[PDB]
Automatic annotation (TrEMBL), chains A, B, C, D, E, F:
<protein>
    <recommendedName>
        <fullName>Flagellar M-ring protein</fullName>
    </recommendedName>
</protein>
<comment type="subunit">
    <text>The basal body constitutes a major portion of the flagellar organelle and consists of four rings (L,P,S, and M) mounted on a central rod. The M ring is integral to the inner membrane of the cell and may be connected to the flagellar rod via the S ring. The S (supramembrane ring) lies just distal to the M ring. The L and P rings lie in the outer membrane and the periplasmic space, respectively.</text>
</comment>
<feature type="compositionally biased region" description="Basic and acidic residues">
    <location>
        <begin position="5"/>
        <end position="15"/>
    </location>
</feature>
<comment type="similarity">
    <text>Belongs to the FliF family.</text>
</comment>
<comment type="function">
    <text>The M ring may be actively involved in energy transduction.</text>
</comment>
Length: 144, 144, 144, 144, 144, 144
């Protein structure tokens, strides 16, 4: 029960560790050893979702049987059968999708252009996405 | 029964410990050894939620059988059958989701800008989220 | 029967002990050894709640079969069948949720600002929440 | 039968003992050894309560089948079926809840402010609650 | 359960490693050792989708049986049967499709034409596709 | 499950390797050793598609039985049966079809005619096809 849950926790940590390497592999040759520091956080969910969809197309009907009666003298009778396009889809979702991610970078003292360029580099280095509400902050402060 | 519950408690502590490392890895090189102190708290729940949804689309009907009678002289009769889009979803929730989290940081004596910058760094260092009603306080006081 | 109940009691004590460490880890470097004292209390419940909800959506009906008769000369007849969205939820609550918590801190002799700042630090150190009717008091008295 | 009941008695005593330590851990460094005395009492109950609730929502009805007849010439007929939201809850109460608690403190000879402050400290030290009709008295008398 | 999931994670890393070789095999002979740095990220999904389609062609009907009655004096009666073209398709999707990919390249200090040419080379070196919302950034910054 | 999927990945790499030989076998004797560099990418899918078609020919009917009645005095009655051409097709698709492919070639420094001729040679050397949205870029840049 709770034995497996702890394992899940460890997995999250692993993800963070991976990120903590990648940012280390890019900022080190450009900024320098001891002139920067950063940390990351990854939050995920472990739900279990299944979906079954069964759709129809009402705009394309096909007739199979038809009966009509038009007895004037005004008796009018009609009986028709139809066949429709059916689509069935069954989907199972993954377990462990990343929900949110936060990255913070502090640089020892910079102009606006340099910070913007470093942020642009980190955009591809990390993979920031605005759809998931991700967070990425880069700034320069005085060390001590 | 109660033997497993205690384990859950330990898990919470582990989470706090993790945070107590991350804040230590960022504030130490910028502020300095012995010039800061902080503690965290994490509160979670261990419920068990299952959901089953079965939705329909009323705006897209598809006809299958149709019978009509229009006997004037004004007898009018109609009988129709319909087919609708059906969606079935089954979801199971996780056990151990984080509900609230509190972070407090005290700095030995600072200007407003420095405190704001440190708070901004901690925002990404911890992962503060306003949706869950999280709490983060950073301030400077005189030590003794 | 009563053998397990005693165990529950011990668990509560453990919680208090944890708090008695955290307040010790924050107030000690700022106030000093022998200049403060504090105690905490945690009260919980051990009920067992299960819930089953079965909800409907009346504003979105979907028709399945329809029969109508409009014989003028004013005979009017109608018979319709409907399909509705059904949601089923099954929830099981935890055992051992914290209900109330009280914290009291006495400081050896202070200005209002210092007490307010210490209270603000303790807010994040402990995790005071007004929703549960929690209690936190910090004051300064003359020792002997 | 009566063998277990005695055990329950012992449990109550344990509770009192715990309180007799906590008040000892707070009043001793501020008041001094031999300048105070206190005793506590805890009264509980050992009932066994089970509850089963089955609630409905009358303000949100959902129609399933409907038949109508409107034969003028004024024959009016209607027959409708409804579906309602159902909630089922099953609860089991704890055994050993604290009902009332009394605390009495006597201090060797004090001003009103000092007594008020000591009472405020004891409020958080013990956890006095007015909902349960708890009792807490602190006063100063001449010893002999 | 969770044992296989971790394997999936490793697979993603492998993909990135492959890319980290290819960019190394192209930029090295043109730019030079120690004058560039780059990192990549690949995000995928592990769903399980099955589809079943059953289509009809209403514009091409074929008659099988036909009955007609044209009794003048105006009794008109008709009854026809039809045969239609039926197409049945069953599809199963893959597991592990690439969703998004980010590439970032920094070059030590360049004119616009050189950067454009390097980007064009990397377009074929990596396989950037705008349909999936892929990201590729190449820029020049001052190293330190 | 995931053990076979990895194998699929390896297969893709093999394809690329093959291409990396063919371009090496053509450009080397014409351009020269160390005056060019190139890389390729191949993306495929591993779906599983089955199709069943059942077609009719409505323009060529064949009569089998016929009954007619032409009682004047104007009773007219007809009843005919038909036989139609039926075609049944069952198809199973391959697994591992190439979807897209990208080729990039950089030549050390050229006139437009030479680049056009090299592109024309590579067209047959690789097999560029515009139907699949393939990509082939050849350009000349200054090396370093």
């Amino acid at each position: 029960a709770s034995a497996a849950r702890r394992k899940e926790q460890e997995l999250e940590r692993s993800q963070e560790q991976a990120l903590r390497e990648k940012i280390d592999s890019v900022l080190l040759p450009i900024l320098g050893y001891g002139n920067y520091t950063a940390q990351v956080d990854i939050q995920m969910d472990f739900s279990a979702v299944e979906q079954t969809r069964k759709r129809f197309d009402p705009n394309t009907p096909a007739t199979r049987s038809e009966y009509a009666l038009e007895d004037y003298n005004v008796r009018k009778e009609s009986t028709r059968n139809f066949e429709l396009d059916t689509t069935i889809s069954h989907e199972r979702k993954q377990t462990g999708t990343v929900a949110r991610q936060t990255v913070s970078v502090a640089i020892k003292d910079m102009s606006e252009s340099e910070i913007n360029a470093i942020r642009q580099v980190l955009i591809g280095t990390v993979g920031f996405d605005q759809g998931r509400g991700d967070l990425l902050n880069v700034l320069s402060v005085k060390f001590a």
